[PDB]
Design a protein around this ligand. Structure first.
Ligand SMILES: [Ca+2]
Length: 312
């Protein structure tokens, strides 16, 4: 597999478990720090980063009834400039730019306790596909599916239903939606970290997935595996392979990577493009830091960049 070695430029530093890089509708940049702890208990944070200086501001340090969050993944909404945050203790949060937030679900659409979440992806229809590798949300004792198969997948729909759509993953992690050229969502990709697999499903409709398949194979036998993922504008899927020192690049058909990107650190965790550029922001857990590098082409547009009242 061909490997490329682009220049990585430092963006910011000292962010425990740096994760969830995201741009909002105004171009501001945010990161989550899931692994910040106070007195050994979760006290994770959502940060805004000034791209010009690298300075960090904590906008939200979410807690519900004294249970601190482990915010781990983020996407920006389209119709309002607000962040949807996957939290390993609190489930799914919606966080405003002013730092206020709401916890969306204690239970799912069937009344089962919600599980703690790690990453999420909006499709262009506005449905939010979410990985849930933790066990039950606070106040339940914290557990996660690194060793046993109890991780789940949800779809939080436009009509506000939190629907469990699959179960029994060993640490479902990154997630992404593939769209037809006309914008129709049609494939969901889910990383399963320790098994070194990417799984696919056909998206038949909102919260309707079928044809579960082992879509992609992640190199290496290190502890870790696929963490976050992002599509480029040609539907290549770039996947942080935590523990391998590389980001893998899969072509549209999956299988084995067609290219790797060597990083100057062992533990890439997540990645996100700056809108309308080739610049990918990458979080990593060797140094607990954020970097950027130039890819070969622009990113796939996220839902927040599309227009509700568009014509074309
Ligand atoms: Ca993750």
């Amino acid at each position: 597999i061909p490997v490329i070695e682009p220049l990585f430029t430092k963006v910011t530093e000292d962010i425990p478990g740096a994760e969830g890089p995201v741009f909002d509708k105004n171009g501001d940049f945010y990161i989550v720090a899931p692994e910040v702890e106070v007195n050994g208990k979760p006290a994770g944070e959502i940060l805004r980063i000034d791209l010009k200086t690298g300075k960090k501001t904590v906008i939200c340090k979410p807690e519900v009834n004294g249970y601190g969050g482990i915010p781990a993944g983020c996407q920006c909404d389209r119709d309002a400039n607000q962040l949807f945050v996957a939290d390993m203790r609190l489930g799914l949060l919606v966080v405003q730019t002013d730092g206020t937030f709401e916890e969306i679900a204690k239970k799912d659409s069937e009344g089962r306790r919600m599980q703690g979440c790690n990453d999420c992806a909006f499709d262009y229809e506005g449905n939010l596909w979410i990985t849930a590798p933790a066990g039950e949300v606070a106040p339940a004792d914290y557990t996660r599916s690194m060793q046993e198969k109890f991780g789940s997948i949800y779809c939080f729909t436009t009509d506000g239903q939190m629907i469990q759509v699959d179960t029994a993953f060993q640490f479902p992690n990154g997630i992404a939606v593939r769209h037809m050229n006309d914008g129709r969502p049609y494939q969901l990709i889910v990383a399963e970290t320790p098994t070194k697999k990417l799984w696919s499903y056909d998206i038949k409709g909102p919260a309707k997935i079928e044809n579960k398949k082992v879509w992609g194979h992640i190199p290496g036998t290190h502890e870790g595996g696929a963490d976050g993922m992002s599509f480029d504008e040609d539907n290549n899927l770039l996947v942080a392979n935590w523990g391998s020192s590389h980001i893998e690049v899969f072509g549209p058909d999956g299988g084995q990577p067609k290219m790797r990107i060597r990083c100057p650190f062992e533990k890439p965790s997540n990645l996100h493009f700056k809108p309308q550029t080739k610049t990918i922001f990458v979080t990593e857990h060797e140094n607990n830091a954020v970097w950027k590098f130039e890819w070969q082409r622009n990113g796939k547009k996220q839902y927040c960049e599309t227009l509700k009242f568009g014509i074309f």
